[PDB]
Design a protein around this ligand. Structure first.
Ligand SMILES: Nc1ncnc2c1ncn2[C@@H]1O[C@H](COP(=O)(O)O)[C@@H](O)[C@H]1O
Ligand SMILES: CC(C)=CCSP(=O)(O)OP(=O)(O)O
Ligand SMILES: [Zn+2]
Ligand SMILES: [Zn+2]
Length: 226
C-alpha cells in the first residue's frame, strides 16, 4: 500500500492538508501524535474539530485518560505498526503529525523500510514572524468559547482538579505556558477563563511564543526522512 507521510512543526497546516488528501482519496488519516491521544486535552493538543474533518476519518493511536500519562513513544510506535498492518489490503493511508519521538521511532524501525510506496511531505517554519502570526490565530481558536468543545482554558481548569493531572499538564505545551502564566500573575487556574481584556492578549502571545520554541526544537530533532 501507499503511505502518504506528512510531518513538520506545530501550526504548519499539516492537518488541513491531510483532511484535503483524505477527502480526495477516501483514505483515513492516522495521527502521528501522542499527546492527541488524550481527548480530555483535545483542543489544546490540536485535535481538529468534528466540523473540520468534513466526514473524513482521523485515527488516534490510543484513547486515554490524561492521568495515565501521555502515551510513551515506543507504545505509540507499536500501535502505529498495528493500525497500518491490519489495513494491509486497502490502497493507501495518510500518516500525519508532529511527534518528535514518534517520527524518530519510525525512522529507526525496520517496519517502514520495505513493502510500501511512500509520498513524503515535510513542512517547515520559515519566517519566525509569520510563524507567530499563524500561531496567535490558532491559539485564539483554541481559546474560543464554543457550543461543542471546551476551550484549552476550560480543559485546563477541568483537569486542575485532579492533583495527578497537574504534573502532566506542566509538561505539555500551551498548558505549561498557561500554568506558568497563572503563577506569574498570582491567578488561580480556575480564573484563567475570565482573564480580562488584554491579559488575554499577553497569554495568547506567550503560548504562541512557546509554540515557537517547540517548532524550533522540532526542526532540530526531527529525523531527516529518506
Ligand atoms: N499535540 C501536542 N500538543 C501539545 N504539546 C505537544 C504535542 N505534541 C508534543 N507536545 C510536546 O512535546 C513533548 C512530546 O514529545 P513528542 O511527542 O516527541 O513531540 C510533549 O511532552 C509536549 O510537551
Ligand atoms: C500545539 C502543539 C505544540 C502541537 C499541536 S499542533 P499540530 O502539529 O497539530 O498542527 P498542524 O496540523 O501542523 O496545524
Ligand atoms: Zn494537526
Ligand atoms: Zn515543546
Amino acid at each position: 500500500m501507499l503511505l502518504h507521510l506528512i510531518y513538520g512543526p506545530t501550526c504548519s497546516g499539516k492537518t488541513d492538508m491531510a483532511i484535503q488528501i483524505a477527502q480526495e482519496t477516501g483514505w483515513p488519516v492516522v495521527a502521528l501524535d501522542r499527546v492527541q491521544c488524550c481527548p480530555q486535552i483535545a483542543t489544546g493538543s490540536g485535535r481538529p474539530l468534528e466540523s473540520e474533518l468534513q466526514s473524513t476519518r482521523r485515527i488516534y493511536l490510543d484513547s486515554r485518560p490524561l492521568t495515565e500519562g501521555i502515551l510513551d513513544a515506543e507504545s505509540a510506535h507499536r500501535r502505529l505498526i498495528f493500525e497500518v498492518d491490519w489495513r494491509k489490503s486497502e490502497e493507501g493511508l495518510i500518516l500525519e503529525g508532529g511527534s518528535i519521538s514518534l517520527l524518530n521511532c519510525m525512522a529507526k524501525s525496520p517496519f517502514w523500510r520495505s513493502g510500501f510506496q511512500w509520498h513524503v511531505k515535510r513542512l517547515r517554519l520559515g519566517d519566525s514572524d509569520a510563524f507567530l502570526t499563524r500561531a496567535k490565530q490558532r491559539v485564539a481558536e483554541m481559546f474560543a468559547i464554543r457550543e461543542d468543545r471546551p476551550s484549552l482554558l476550560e480543559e485546563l481548569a477541568e483537569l486542575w482538579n485532579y492533583p495527578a493531572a497537574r504534573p502532566i499538564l506542566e509538561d505539555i505545551d500551551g498548558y505549561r505556558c498557561a500554568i506558568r502564566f497563572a503563577r506569574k500573575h498570582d491567578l488561580a487556574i480556575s480564573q484563567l477563563p475570565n482573564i480580562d481584556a488584554g491579559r488575554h492578549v499577553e497569554l495568547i502571545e506567550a503560548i504562541a511564543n512557546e509554540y515557537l520554541e517547540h517548532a524550533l526544537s522540532q526542526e532540530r530533532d526531527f529525523p531527516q526522512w529518506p
